[PDB]
């Protein structure tokens, strides 16, 4: 749930646990005071979520990571094309 | 109305009711303009 769910209600999860929403909050309390699962729950609209910082850094930082992987990716095909031309059009 | 034509204030006047609402436009920090107030002065202090 913490891996794949960006944001879920406080009824769908409790339906996936087959128990109370109160017992569900007791389950989500002792793990975030253990801070082994980071979550920011709600009890007015029940809109609870996982792994939500603000990130002033990792947007453009991971964007630059996509830049580096991008330039490596266009670096990959470039020397791959030439030999493929050479196994048809050498002599 | 000429303060919107001059653009002094942005938000709407409830001309039917009578009140003048105004939005809360904050975070001018994420604008091009403090870099503009810089850029007026960067080249200036380079010139001096």
């Amino acid at each position: 749930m913490a891996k794949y769910y960006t944001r879920i209600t406080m009824k769908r999860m409790a339906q996936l646990l087959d128990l109370s929403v109160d017992e569900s909050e007791a389950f989500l309390s002792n793990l975030v005071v253990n801070k082994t699962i980071f979550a920011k729950v709600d009890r007015l609209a029940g809109i609870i979520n996982f792994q939500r910082p603000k990130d002033p850094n990792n947007l453009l930082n991971d964007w630059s990571q996509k830049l580096n992987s991008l330039m490596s990716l266009v670096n990959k095909t470039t020397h791959l094309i030439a030999k493929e031309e050479m196994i048809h059009n050498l002599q | 109305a000429k303060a919107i034509r001059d653009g002094v204030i942005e938000a709407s006047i409830n001309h039917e009711k009578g009140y003048v609402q105004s939005k809360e436009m904050i975070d001018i920090y994420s604008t091009r303009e403090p870099q503009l107030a810089f850029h007026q002065r960067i080249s200036f202090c380079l010139d001096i």
């Binding site: - | 000429k2 709407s12 001309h15 870099q35 960067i42």
Partner: protein
């Protein structure tokens, strides 16, 4: 009075022309009000019935309100001046700052390292 938002006082000066006729000039003063609030009728005017913005300028119900209401928007409706307001498309450009500003960074580096 034409400088600030004084409008009805201008029509009071159209109630007081003391020197002589001044008619040829107050009719161009008519027209320069006509395009004025024909232009600034387009503001954040959330909904107005066919009374207020109707009788501020000159015209109650001739088809001059069809001339403005069909020249521009503010469409003739169920006692309704339609407030259309998008104001959404033109922001959110980094590219024009990434062109002009990329020019200006080089304009920094010219008078930073190169002797003149």
């Amino acid at each position: 009075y034409l400088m600030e938002g004084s409008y009805n006082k201008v029509f009071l000066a159209k109630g007081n022309i003391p020197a002589e006729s001044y008619t040829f000039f107050i009719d161009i003063l008519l027209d320069t009000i006509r395009d004025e609030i024909a232009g600034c009728i387009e503001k954040a005017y959330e909904k107005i019935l066919f009374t207020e913005a109707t009788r501020i300028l000159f015209f109650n119900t001739p088809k001059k309100m069809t001339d403005y209401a069909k020249k521009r928007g503010w469409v003739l409706g169920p006692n309704n001046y339609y407030s259309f307001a998008s104001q959404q498309q033109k922001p959110e450009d980094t590219t024009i700052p990434s062109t002009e500003l990329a020019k200006q960074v080089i304009e920094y580096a010219r008078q930073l390292e190169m002797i003149v």
